[PDB]
Each structure stands twice: as structure tokens, then as C-alpha cells.
Amino acid sequence: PSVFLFPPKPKDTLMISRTPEVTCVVVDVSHEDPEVKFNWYVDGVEVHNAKTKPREEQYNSTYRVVSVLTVLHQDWLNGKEYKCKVSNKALPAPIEKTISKAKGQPREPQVYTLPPSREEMTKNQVSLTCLVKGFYPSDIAVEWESNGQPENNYKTTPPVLDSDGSFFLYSKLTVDKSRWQQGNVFSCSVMHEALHNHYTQKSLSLSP
Amino acid sequence: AAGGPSVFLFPPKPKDTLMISRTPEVTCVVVDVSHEDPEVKFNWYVDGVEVHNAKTKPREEQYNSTYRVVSVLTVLHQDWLNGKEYKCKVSNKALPAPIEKTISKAKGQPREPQVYTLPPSREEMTKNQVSLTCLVKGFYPSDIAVEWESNGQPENNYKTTPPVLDSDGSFFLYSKLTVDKSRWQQGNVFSCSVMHEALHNHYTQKSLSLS
Numbered sequence: 001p002s003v004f005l006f007p008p009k010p011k012d013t014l015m016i017s018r019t020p021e022v023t024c025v026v027v028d029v030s031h032e033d034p035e036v037k038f039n040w041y042v043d044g045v046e047v048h049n050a051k052t053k054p055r056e057e058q059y060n061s062t063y064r065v066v067s068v069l070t071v072l073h074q075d076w077l078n079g080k081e082y083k084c085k086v087s088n089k090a091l092p093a094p095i096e097k098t099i100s101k102a103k104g105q106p107r108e109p110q111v112y113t114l115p116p117s118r119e120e121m122t123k124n125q126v127s128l129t130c131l132v133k134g135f136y137p138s139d140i141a142v143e144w145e146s147n148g149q150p151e152n153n154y155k156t157t158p159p160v161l162d163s164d165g166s167f168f169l170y171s172k173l174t175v176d177k178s179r180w181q182q183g184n185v186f187s188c189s190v191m192h193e194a195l196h197n198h199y200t201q202k203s204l205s206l207s208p
Numbered sequence: 209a210a211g212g213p214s215v216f217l218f219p220p221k222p223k224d225t226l227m228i229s230r231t232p233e234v235t236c237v238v239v240d241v242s243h244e245d246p247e248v249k250f251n252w253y254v255d256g257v258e259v260h261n262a263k264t265k266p267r268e269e270q271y272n273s274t275y276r277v278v279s280v281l282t283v284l285h286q287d288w289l290n291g292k293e294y295k296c297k298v299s300n301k302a303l304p305a306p307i308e309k310t311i312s313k314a315k316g317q318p319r320e321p322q323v324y325t326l327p328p329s330r331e332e333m334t335k336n337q338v339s340l341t342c343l344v345k346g347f348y349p350s351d352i353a354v355e356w357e358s359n360g361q362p363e364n365n366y367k368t369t370p371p372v373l374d375s376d377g378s379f380f381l382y383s384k385l386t387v388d389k390s391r392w393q394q395g396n397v398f399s400c401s402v403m404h405e406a407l408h409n410h411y412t413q414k415s416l417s418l419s
């Protein structure tokens with residue numbers, strides 16, 4: 001009976017309206033004995049606002065069981081540690097796992113939008129590029145929007161270690177050449193802990 | 209022998225397979241050859257046919273007090289690019305049966321990358337350093353080589369992202385070259401070179417300069 005501990009999603013830790021959650025999912029719990037207790041700790045203290053979802057049989061007839069702990073944005077961003085502690089009857093030792101935010105002095109990313117190259121204008125789909133460089137540590141969120149809705153067709157590289165010890169990444173958003181040619185404005189939104197309000201937005205549109 | 213000698217098979221480097229003036233090599237490396245049983249025999253096979261052009265290196269002693277033997281098979285660019293299988297067979301009397309390893313190019317229909325160069329953002333023109341971007345878009349499979357040069361010489365203060373899987377099943381990546389604002393101001397020309405099996409001549413080069 002083995003444990004997996006998942007951290008809150010970056011964007012949930014960065015925007016205070018959202019709810020960051022730490023997840024403790026126990027997998028491979030027998031029919032034999034299947035009951036399982038969850039106790040949660042922040043810097044070694046007992047918390048009791050965990051919402052635990054009932055046992056779930058897979059096809060592996062083996063049961064999965066999830067305890068979700070809601071956390072405070074500042075506690076996570078300040079580096080506090082979260083331990084999940086699981087008590088099954090199916091092994092003597094109640095067994096445990098910790099996580100916390102990755103360490104490192106925050107570095108503020110620079111965000112730059114780049115129009116498509118003139119060679120791509122022969123195609124009827126074109127690429128809009130968002131470059132995010134100089135950030136540390138690497139937990140980040142990047143998204144594209146237009147006129148207040150999210151834009152589907154994009155993909156973001158994973159962070160890449162630059163020469164100066166900071167990270168960079170690129171996000172490519174693909175759109176119809178027509179929408180670009182009509183002067184539609186597209187925004188790159190970036191969320192990172194070293195930004196003011198943890199948020200910035202840079203716009204991009206067909207220039208005159 | 210540690211838990212017996214063990215074998216590792218290394219493919220050629222992509223660039224060597226793609227430029228025909230370079231020499232692509234498959235390398236078979238055997239480690240943990242005991243002092244009691246120090247002889248090792250390589251047999252090479254390409255699509256199940258033995259070849260005899262391999263170049264076997266002496267036999268070098270490691271600090272664990274145990275041997276390392278390397279054999280090097282030169283391969284044909286087009287044989288590798290056509291998907292042929294390379295097979296190393298290693299015999300040593302510390303082993304009950306000979307060990308064999310197989311290697312070959314990543315499979316799948318090739319697709320040609322498009323290469324676009326993007327100048328630095330106007331907002332970056334405040335800083336001392338600016339970023340020149342090479343977008344390489346739509347390629348399959350993912351083995352690729354991307355380099356930056358200026359006046360024939362490499363630049364090397366650049367980083368390439370790994371291939372990212374795109375929505376249409378192909379890959380793309382970006383290559384970022386960081387340059388002194390002054391060299392970009394002077395009109396210095398920079399060039400992104402790409403090597404990939406679906407390019408004409410396996411090669412292309414896109415240039416950008418100021419204005």
C-alpha cells in the first residue's frame with residue numbers, strides 16, 4: 001500500500017482568489033483490510049480541515065483513496081512543509097510523505113511578445129510567441145487570451161536553464177492569419193511569485 | 209565480472225548522421241570485464257548481416273580493478289536514415305551466453321520543419337542584452353540539430369528548448385541567442401542553422417539582422 005503526494009498547482013498558489021490544495025492519494029489498498037486514516041501536518045502541527053474522498057476500486061481490484069488538504073497561499077509561498085500521514089491496518093508502520101515549495105531566491109521574469117515572422121504569412125496559420133526569461137524558481141503559469149476568453153491552440157515549452165542560472169520559456173499560440181490580419185489583440189498572461197501581484201500581461205496585435 | 213560484464217550500445221550523434229561529410233558511429237561499450245576472463249569478442253550485424261569494418265579499441269583498466277572494452281562501427285548515413293538495425297554481440301567466457309544489444313533510428317513518418325527567425329521585442333531594446341529567436345516548427349521525428357552562427361563562427365551563448373510535442377503530432381522548439389545590444393545595433397548578421405532528415409540536403413539556414 002503506497003502513497004503519492006501532489007503539490008498545489010502553481011496558478012492556484014499564485015492567485016489568491018483560487019484555492020491551493022495538497023493531495024495525498026493512497027494506491028493499492030487490499031480488500032482484505034481497506035480502511036485507512038489520514039492526518040495532516042504543517043510545520044509539525046495537526047490540521048483537521050482535510051476532505052477525504054471515499055475508497056475507489058479500480059480494475060486492479062485494489063482501491064484508491066484521496067485526502068485533499070486546502071492550504072493558505074502564504075504558507076506555501078513561505079516554504080512551510082506539509083506531511084501526509086497514512087494509517088492502514090495492512091502494514092505495521094503508519095507511513096508518511098512530505099512536500100514543500102522548491103527553494104530559491106525569487107527572480108522576476110521579463111515577458112516579451114513577438115509577432116510572426118513575415119515568412120509565416122504565406123501560410124494560413126501563424127505563430128504568436130511569448131518569451132518569458134529571467135525567472136527563478138521554475139514554478140510558473142503562462143496562458144493566452146483574446147477579448148476576455150482563453151485561446152485554445154497554444155503550447156508552452158518547459159522551463160530551460162539559461163546561462164545566468166535563471167530560467168526561460170516560450171509559449172507559441174497558433175491562430176488563423178485572418179484573425180491576426182483583422183487587428184485582433186492577443187494577450188500573454190504570466191503568473192510567477194517574483195512578479196508584482198504575481199501577475200503580468202503583455203499584449204500583441206498587428207502593427208500599423 | 210561484477211554481476212558479470214555488462215553492455216551498452218550508443219547511437220550516432222544526429223548531426224553526424226545528417227551531414228554526409230561527418231562520420232556517424234555506433235559504439236558498443238562493455239564494462240566489468242574480470243581479470244580472470246579478460247577477452248571480449250564483438251560481432252556486428254546490420255539487419256542481421258555480419259559486417260567486419262568495426263574498429264575495436266585495445267582494452268583499458270578502470271579504477272574498480274575491472275575492464276572496459278569499446279568497439280566502434282562506422283555506419284552509412286543512408287543505412288541509418290533508412291531504419292536499418294545495428295546489433296552488437298559480445299562474447300566473454302565469464303558469461304553463460306553471449307549478450308546482444310540492438311539500436312536503430314526513431315521510427316515514424318518524417319515531416320519537414322519550418323524555420324523562422326524573430327528579432328528582439330522593441331521593449332527588450334532598453335537592456336544591454338537582446339534575444340534573437342529561432343522557431344523550428346512542424347518536424348518529425350525529434351532528433352534535430354540547431355545552431356547559431358555569426359560571420360562563419362559559432363556563437364554558443366544560446367540555449368535551445370527540448371522538442372515540445374505540438375497539437376498536430378509534430379514537434380517544435382525555440383532557440384534563443386543572447387547578444388550584446390551593440391552588436392545587434394552595428395548590423396551584425398546572425399544565422400540559425402537547422403539539420404533534420406526531412407530538409408532538402410538535411411540542412412537549412414535562416415539569417416536575421418537589424419532593420
Ligand SMILES: *[C@@H]1O[C@H](CO[C@@H]2O[C@@H](C)[C@@H](O)[C@@H](O)[C@@H]2O)[C@@H](O[C@@H]2O[C@H](CO)[C@@H](O[C@@H]3O[C@H](CO[C@H]4O[C@H](CO)[C@@H](O)[C@H](O)[C@@H]4O[C@@H]4O[C@H](CO)[C@@H](O)[C@H](O)[C@H]4NC(C)=O)[C@@H](O)[C@H](O[C@H]4O[C@H](CO)[C@@H](O)[C@H](O)[C@@H]4O[C@@H]4O[C@H](CO)[C@@H](O)[C@H](O)[C@H]4NC(C)=O)[C@@H]3O)[C@H](O)[C@H]2NC(C)=O)[C@H](O)[C@H]1NC(C)=O
Pocket residue numbers: 004005006007023025027028058059060062
Ligand atoms: C491499478 O490501476 C491503477 C489505475 O491507474 C492508472 O493511471 C495511469 C498511469 C494509466 O496507466 C491509467 O490507464 C490507469 O488507469 C493504478 O494507478 C496508478 O498507480 C501508479 C503507480 O502506483 C501511479 O504512477 C505514479 O504516478 C505519480 C504521478 O502521477 C500523476 O500523473 C499521472 C500521469 O502519468 C496521472 O495519471 C496521475 O493521476 C497523477 O496525476 C496527479 O493527480 C493529482 C491528484 O489527483 C493531481 O494533484 C495532479 O494534477 C496530477 N499530477 C500530474 C503530474 O499529473 C507519481 O507519484 C509516480 O512517480 C513516482 O515514481 C517514479 C519512480 O521513481 C518516478 O518517476 C517519480 O518521480 C516518482 O518517484 C518519486 O518521486 C519523488 C522524487 O521526485 C520521491 O518522493 C520518491 O523518492 C520517488 N520515487 C518513488 C519510488 O516514489 C508514478 O509515476 C499512477 O499515477 C496511478 N494512476 C492514478 C490515476 O492515480 C494502480 O497503481 C494499479 N495498481 C497496482 C499496479 O497495483
Ligand SMILES: *[C@@H]1O[C@H](CO[C@@H]2O[C@@H](C)[C@@H](O)[C@@H](O)[C@@H]2O)[C@@H](O[C@@H]2O[C@H](CO)[C@@H](O[C@@H]3O[C@H](CO[C@H]4O[C@H](CO)[C@@H](O)[C@H](O)[C@@H]4O[C@@H]4O[C@H](CO)[C@@H](O)[C@H](O)[C@H]4NC(C)=O)[C@@H](O)[C@H](O[C@H]4O[C@H](CO)[C@@H](O)[C@H](O)[C@@H]4O[C@@H]4O[C@H](CO)[C@@H](O)[C@H](O)[C@H]4NC(C)=O)[C@@H]3O)[C@H](O)[C@H]2NC(C)=O)[C@H](O)[C@H]1NC(C)=O
Pocket residue numbers: 210216218235237239240270271272274276
Ligand atoms: C566499474 O567502473 C566502470 C567504469 O566507469 C568509470 O570508472 C569508475 C572507476 C568510476 O570512476 C566511474 O565514475 C566511471 O564512469 C563502470 O561502468 C559504468 O557502468 C554503468 C552501469 O553500471 C554505466 O551506466 C550506463 O550509462 C549510460 C550512459 O553512459 C554515458 O554517459 C556517462 C556519463 O553520464 C559516461 O560515463 C559513459 O561513458 C557514457 O558516455 C557516452 O559514451 C559514448 C561512447 O562511449 C559517447 O558517444 C557519449 O557522448 C557519452 N555520453 C555521455 C553523456 O557521456 C546509460 O545510458 C545507461 O542507462 C541505461 O541503463 C540503466 C541501467 O543500466 C537504466 O537505469 C537507464 O534508464 C538506461 O536504460 C536505457 O534506456 C534507453 C532509453 O530508453 C534504452 O534505449 C536502453 O535500452 C536502456 N538500457 C538499459 C541497460 O536499460 C547506464 O546508466 C556507465 O556508462 C559505465 N561507465 C563508463 C565510463 O563506461 C561500472 O559501473 C563500475 N562497476 C563497479 C562494480 O564498480
